[PDB]
């Protein structure tokens, strides 16, 4: 109060000093709406995988490809994502991820990359130089290779030109490298493009099969196809379905509508919000703040003071003021001498008394305080209007004064205030 009053000695009277603002305790990130989908098993766990010459294009959408499911899918694989680390990609949600899947060899791993060349890079599947997305490359020796000799699986050895970005081609025409036409019969200058994969149990690791799944997203005008907690009556920072803000998530009683989510009120504030995961209505109230004022009976008389957090139901957050919860400090008054809930906040450091006296320091709602000894201390009596008096009114009783009193009373009225005159050019401009 001395700082706000900017004086070393304050007089009797309640002074407004600062504002008590209860800080939020926890943060709730509840935006789940339960909801989960997208299988990955169709593109990852399938026992039979399409060849490189017949690579699939299955864009997963309208569900979430939780990468933690696929982060650990096999002993070892190359999660060669492009443009973003796979871990950072987890929460990085993408509009239309075109998930492509196929199989390659071991020595051809270096040949399967954007801009690569060869009978399987230029001639089976070409990635753009500006390719955005990921490549998932694991081995499937026990699945895509046969111990009896897997010639059923084929890798194309000849094709004409490089594919366009993300383009497909499965041409199986008998290619001609000379002048003699094929005429529909295999022979001179007639080569089949598909060469059967060399997949033997005794074949080297360079000839060992390796599946390759290319999940690629195009950042377009689509929903990112691809994280929660709980709470109680305590005040927190709510994040209900991306509704930023802090408040008291008290239980609600209103009835929402099957489609309404973000309840509101007359003001812009979100008065209520339906709880996503439980499909229940939650009531949002602002954190119980309020100004704090100090009741003091005048430095001269005493340094003892009592404070009043205006507009708070303190029988809660300011009576359960934990270690340094109350703004004016001195946490020794967490309970204080006496806490008296009032219609105008509540008093800390003043003890209520049944006896009613004349108002000395007004507080509000008919409650006043004074430094009256009972042993000088601050009391919080209820203001007394005056000494109740009854006049003996009767049908034939009259009271007539026998004396009088020439009482002289003083009345003070201001008449004029100090005359002033300014000058902008002198004032505004130096």
């Amino acid at each position, epitope marked *: 109060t001395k700082c706000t009053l900017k004086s070393f000695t304050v007089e009797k009277g309640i002074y407004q000093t600062s504002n008590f603002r209860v800080q939020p305790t926890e943060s709730i990130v509840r935006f789940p709406n339960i909801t989960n989908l997208c299988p990955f098993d169709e593109v990852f766990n399938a026992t039979r995988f399409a060849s490189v010459y017949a690579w699939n294009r299955k864009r997963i959408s309208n569900c979430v490809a939780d990468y933690s499911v696929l*982060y*650990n899918f096999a*002993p*070892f*694989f*190359a*999660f*060669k994502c492009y443009g973003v680390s*796979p871990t950072k990609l987890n929460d990085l949600c993408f509009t239309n991820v075109y998930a492509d899947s196929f199989v390659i060899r*071991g*020595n051809e*791993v*270096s040949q399967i990359a954007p801009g690569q060349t060869g009978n399987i890079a230029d001639y089976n599947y070409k990635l753009p130089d500006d390719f955005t997305g990921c490549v998932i*490359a694991w081995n499937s020796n026990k699945l895509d290779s046969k111990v009896g000799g897997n010639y059923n699986y084929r890798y194309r050895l000849f094709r004409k030109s490089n594919l366009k970005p993300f383009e497909r081609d499965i041409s199986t025409e008998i290619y001609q490298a000379g002048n003699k036409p094929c005429n529909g019969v295999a022979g001179v200058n007639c080569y089949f493009p598909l060469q059967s994969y060399g997949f033997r149990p005794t074949y*080297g*690791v*360079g000839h*060992q099969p390796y599946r390759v799944v290319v999940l690629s997203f195009e950042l377009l005008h689509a929903p990112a196809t691809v994280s929660t907690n709980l709470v109680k009556n305590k005040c927190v920072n709510f994040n209900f379905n991306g509704l930023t803000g802090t408040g008291v998530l008290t239980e609600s009683n209103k009835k929402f509508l099957p489609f309404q989510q973000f309840g509101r009120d007359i003001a812009d504030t979100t008065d209520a919000v339906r709880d996503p995961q439980t499909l229940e209505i939650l009531d949002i109230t602002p954190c119980s703040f309020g100004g704090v004022s100090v009741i003091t009976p005048g430095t001269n008389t005493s340094n003892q003071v009592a404070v009043l957090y205006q507009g708070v139901n303190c029988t809660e957050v300011p009576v359960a003021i934990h270690a340094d919860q109350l703004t004016p400090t001195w946490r020794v008054y967490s309970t204080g001498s006496n806490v008296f809930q009032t219609r105008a906040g509540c008093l800390i450091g003043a003890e209520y008394v049944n006896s009613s006296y004349e108002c000395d320091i007004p507080i509000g709602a008919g409650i006043c305080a004074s430094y009256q000894t009972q042993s000088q201390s601050i009391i919080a009596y209820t203001m007394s209007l005056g000494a109740e008096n009854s006049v003996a009114y009767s049908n034939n009783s009259i009271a007539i004064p026998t004396n009088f009193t020439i009482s002289v009373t003083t009345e003070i009225l201001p008449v004029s205030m100090t005359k002033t005159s300014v000058d902008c050019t002198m004032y505004i401009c130096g």
Partner: nanobody
Amino acid sequence: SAVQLQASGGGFVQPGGSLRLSCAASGWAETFGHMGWFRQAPGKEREFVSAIDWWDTVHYYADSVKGRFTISRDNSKNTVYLQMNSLRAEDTATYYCAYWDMDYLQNSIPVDYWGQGTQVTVSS
């Protein structure tokens, strides 16, 4: 690149003895890099011993291990081996499993993973 490297092997050998160590990758990889070996003797630096391409086609052998040490990879258990022969007095070194997270052995320095110590002593 959460490349889980597991180390195994070790012991005591004779001058001209032999050994076989196993290291492997798992979890998930940034890309198929280079599998190699290193020795960081007590107080010494990690020294290039031998690097091998993942597909057992591009092999490397250091001058000190030319004709003495050998490197090979298994084709059915995802393990890559190491041999050592004809050790001298100064070959007592600590060995950590090595890993190159790059497609080409540009230099002996660029690495992204390492192993744990392994004391090697030569005696009869």
